[PDB]
Write a protein that binds this ligand. Sequence first.
Ligand SMILES: *[C@@H]1O[C@H](CO)[C@@H](O[C@@H]2O[C@H](CO)[C@@H](O[C@@H]3O[C@H](CO)[C@@H](O)[C@H](O[C@H]4O[C@H](CO)[C@@H](O)[C@H](O)[C@@H]4O)[C@@H]3O)[C@H](O)[C@H]2NC(C)=O)[C@H](O)[C@H]1NC(C)=O
Ligand SMILES: *[C@@H]1O[C@H](CO)[C@@H](O[C@@H]2O[C@H](CO)[C@@H](O)[C@H](O)[C@H]2NC(C)=O)[C@H](O)[C@H]1NC(C)=O
Ligand SMILES: *[C@@H]1O[C@H](CO)[C@@H](O[C@@H]2O[C@H](CO)[C@@H](O)[C@H](O)[C@H]2NC(C)=O)[C@H](O)[C@H]1NC(C)=O
Ligand SMILES: *[C@@H]1O[C@H](CO)[C@@H](O[C@@H]2O[C@H](CO)[C@@H](O)[C@H](O)[C@H]2NC(C)=O)[C@H](O)[C@H]1NC(C)=O
Ligand SMILES: *[C@@H]1O[C@H](CO)[C@@H](O)[C@H](O)[C@H]1NC(C)=O
Ligand SMILES: *[C@@H]1O[C@H](CO)[C@@H](O)[C@H](O)[C@H]1NC(C)=O
Ligand SMILES: *[C@@H]1O[C@H](CO)[C@@H](O)[C@H](O)[C@H]1NC(C)=O
Ligand SMILES: *[C@@H]1O[C@H](CO)[C@@H](O)[C@H](O)[C@H]1NC(C)=O
Ligand SMILES: *[C@@H]1O[C@H](CO)[C@@H](O)[C@H](O)[C@H]1NC(C)=O
Lengths: 92, 42, 41, 52
Amino acid sequence: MVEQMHTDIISLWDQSLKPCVKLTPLCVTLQCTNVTNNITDDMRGELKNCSFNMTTELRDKKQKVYSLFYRLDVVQINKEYRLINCNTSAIT
Amino acid sequence: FNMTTELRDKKQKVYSLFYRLDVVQINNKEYRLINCNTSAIT
Amino acid sequence: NKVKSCPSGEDCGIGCCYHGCSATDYGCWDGSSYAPYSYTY
Amino acid sequence: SIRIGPGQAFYATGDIIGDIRQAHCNVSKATWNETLGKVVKQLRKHFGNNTI
Ligand SMILES: *[C@@H]1O[C@H](CO)[C@@H](O[C@@H]2O[C@H](CO)[C@@H](O[C@@H]3O[C@H](CO)[C@@H](O)[C@H](O[C@H]4O[C@H](CO)[C@@H](O)[C@H](O)[C@@H]4O)[C@@H]3O)[C@H](O)[C@H]2NC(C)=O)[C@H](O)[C@H]1NC(C)=O
Ligand SMILES: *[C@@H]1O[C@H](CO)[C@@H](O[C@@H]2O[C@H](CO)[C@@H](O)[C@H](O)[C@H]2NC(C)=O)[C@H](O)[C@H]1NC(C)=O
Ligand SMILES: *[C@@H]1O[C@H](CO)[C@@H](O[C@@H]2O[C@H](CO)[C@@H](O)[C@H](O)[C@H]2NC(C)=O)[C@H](O)[C@H]1NC(C)=O
Ligand SMILES: *[C@@H]1O[C@H](CO)[C@@H](O[C@@H]2O[C@H](CO)[C@@H](O)[C@H](O)[C@H]2NC(C)=O)[C@H](O)[C@H]1NC(C)=O
Ligand SMILES: *[C@@H]1O[C@H](CO)[C@@H](O)[C@H](O)[C@H]1NC(C)=O
Ligand SMILES: *[C@@H]1O[C@H](CO)[C@@H](O)[C@H](O)[C@H]1NC(C)=O
Ligand SMILES: *[C@@H]1O[C@H](CO)[C@@H](O)[C@H](O)[C@H]1NC(C)=O
Ligand SMILES: *[C@@H]1O[C@H](CO)[C@@H](O)[C@H](O)[C@H]1NC(C)=O
Ligand SMILES: *[C@@H]1O[C@H](CO)[C@@H](O)[C@H](O)[C@H]1NC(C)=O
């Protein structure tokens, strides 16, 4: 019963993620800095303020956007960073 | 050829050997794959 | 040396361009074409 | 292995080691000739004993 439950929980997980928005376009070069606004000692370096050139509704138009990421989700390449998933898998 | 890499913005220059039967001349050095005008290839 | 400095623009493996490299193309967002690189020795 | 994107890669043929020869198949000649003789006799049973 444990093997069937394991299989069914994984199956339901994948069924739920399957129809959701794909984030493949986000595996682009990020330009990140440290978040230093009211940062406690325990959180220094934990949040990265990453800017990037993102696509828009139209393929010929771009937008410059930023997002905060946790240190564990962003890996340094060569202030240039990439998501940890860029060399392993597409993320949904 | 110029093909994408792990990141969508950065591109890379790579090479590969192909058999004549798989490559069709376009336009001496410019070629495309025979599948380019009929179907995506898996 | 062949520094491949990309004096002005984003440096992508097939070229340098003032406007950045387009994620959905093999060109640059507004610039379309890639610029040659400057080299030093 | 040339990566195309996250979790995806294309496998390119690399440099050939050694000499470059073509592909080929060796069919035993005596066996093949005997096999065709048998095929011809059986075809003659349908097309005629004196049909070329
Ligand atoms: C989003 O896209 C925009 C453009 O669409 C992009 O802005 C561009 O950034 C590059 C660099 O990131 C700018 O080019 C710079 O120009 C200055 C001129 O003084 C150079 O000094 C810069 O660096 C040089 O020196 C460095 C240190 O030696 C070298 O490492 C480097 O290779 C250079 O030699 C660089 O060339 C370009 O001008 C802007 N373009 C515009 C229109 O502002 C932006 O960075 C992208 N953002 C993200 C997060 O990807
Ligand atoms: C990869 O892309 C670059 C950039 O477009 C190509 O280099 C260009 O080639 C044309 C040929 O007419 C030149 O006029 C440009 O000045 C070149 N630009 C740069 C930045 O080099 C390159 O040939 C492409 N490679 C392949 C294999 O297609
Ligand atoms: C896809 O491209 C191939 C390559 O050109 C086409 O094949 C040619 O078709 C013409 C017209 O029938 C022939 O005269 C040529 O001999 C064919 N071979 C070549 C190498 O040109 C093919 O027809 C194209 N298919 C579509 C649907 O466009
Ligand atoms: C195939 O062509 C390439 C050139 O495009 C030949 O040269 C090598 O190209 C690679 C490009 O990734 C370089 O890293 C190597 O250094 C090049 N070799 C040398 C000696 O400079 C390559 O040898 C060709 N291969 C075959 C089998 O013809
Ligand atoms: C971010 O914090 C790390 C902590 O090791 C430090 O090395 C780095 O220089 C900091 N960067 C900025 C822009 O403050
Ligand atoms: C992918 O990137 C991570 C982080 O740099 C690295 O540890 C790993 O070995 C890389 N290769 C993979 C996951 O095949
Ligand atoms: C095929 O190879 C075997 C050796 O593995 C050899 O004994 C046999 O005679 C060969 N047959 C032909 C038709 O060349
Ligand atoms: C095939 O066998 C026949 C006899 O059945 C013989 O006359 C003929 O010469 C043979 N051909 C070859 C190529 O050995
Ligand atoms: C053809 O040859 C066979 C012997 O192999 C014989 O039995 C048969 O009658 C012959 N048929 C004709 C039409 O000659």
